[PDB]
């Protein structure tokens, strides 16, 4: 496989003769394709966190859970979502959508979820006071493509709803594998904290799984079609 080029088929996948393995590589025979030496291992780590939101009662659609992409609310007019605690902002941005985490000292005092359609008005490390706008929400706001809502609680205060969302999503981290290293973990494997992913000559440069997650192989050195 040409350097930097990522494979079309995945390790283990049954393959017909003539099928395209890589952008410039076409298979000559039927059989099982096998990854030889993956250069980059992408591990999607499993995170389950409880985060809040407040919306105009008229703009939100009542559901017990939200699948990725599902419409969360439709706002007649632009709405300013405001902080309910004072703290410093830790902004953590997903593919689309964001998480916002307020902390005083180092103890987190609030965790907010900004779905898509909600533009942060704050930046990482900004000091905020109760009632000041964190994010502008304009038009239709929906769940991001990579993140779900497993449980949805709604409290009603005045003209607003406060959603307590139990959110589940995977955060990718990439690891580079050097020629003297071997991947000790299979494609689609589940790893816990401490589990070895890639092995090497000396204890450092080893890849140990940071927390719970699933493993994906990219950029193989070559593909062996058997």
């Amino acid at each position: 496989l040409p350097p930097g080029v990522d494979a079309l088929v995945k390790d283990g996948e049954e393959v017909v003769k003539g099928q395209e393995l890589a952008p410039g590589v076409v298979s000559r025979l039927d059989g099982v394709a096998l990854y030889r030496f993956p250069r980059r291992v992408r591990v999607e780590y499993v995170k389950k966190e409880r985060a809040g939101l407040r919306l105009p009662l008229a703009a939100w659609v009542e559901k017990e859970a939200y699948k990725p992409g599902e419409i969360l609310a439709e706002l007649p007019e632009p709405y300013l979502f405001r902080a309910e605690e004072e703290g410093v902002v830790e902004l953590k941005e997903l593919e689309e959508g964001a998480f916002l985490v307020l902390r005083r000292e180092d103890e987190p005092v609030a965790t907010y979820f900004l779905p898509v359609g909600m533009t942060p008005l704050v930046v990482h490390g900004e000091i905020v006071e109760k009632g000041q706008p964190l994010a502008e929400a304009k038009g239709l706001l929906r769940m991001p493509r990579q993140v779900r809502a497993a449980q949805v609680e709604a409290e009603e205060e005045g003209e607003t709803v406060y959603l307590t969302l139990f959110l589940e999503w995977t955060e990718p981290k990439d690891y580079r594998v050097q020629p003297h290293m071997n991947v000790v973990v299979p494609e689609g494997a589940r790893v816990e904290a401490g589990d070895k992913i890639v092995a090497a000559i000396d204890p450092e440069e080893e890849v140990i799984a940071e927390a719970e997650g699933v493993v994906h192989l990219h950029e193989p050195a070559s593909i062996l079609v058997v």
Partner: protein, 85 residues
């Protein structure tokens, strides 16, 4: 011409084979410990099964004649081991 039919190794391919060879030797050591069986004898049974039925013969140092009867017994003794062994 026969030499030219085996492709040369990539640095990656070379390290992989070398790595597996070293590890295989460490494995033979462990099987000696577990079973209380001769490491050399173990190596010939392992090697016999990889090379296939084609080559099976007595080795000058081994105390037992190495024939499909004896290699089946020892191979069946190895396969009688617990999963982690």
């Amino acid at each position: 011409h026969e030499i030219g039919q085996v492709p040369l190794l990539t640095l990656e391919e070379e390290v992989e084979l070398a790595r597996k060879v070293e590890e295989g030797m460490e494995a033979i050591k462990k099987l000696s410990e577990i079973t209380g069986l001769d490491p050399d004898l173990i190596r010939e049974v392992v090697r016999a099964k990889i090379l296939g039925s084609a080559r099976v013969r007595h080795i000058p140092g081994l105390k037992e004649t190495l024939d499909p009867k004896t290699v089946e017994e020892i191979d069946q003794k190895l396969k009688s081991l617990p999963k982690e062994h």
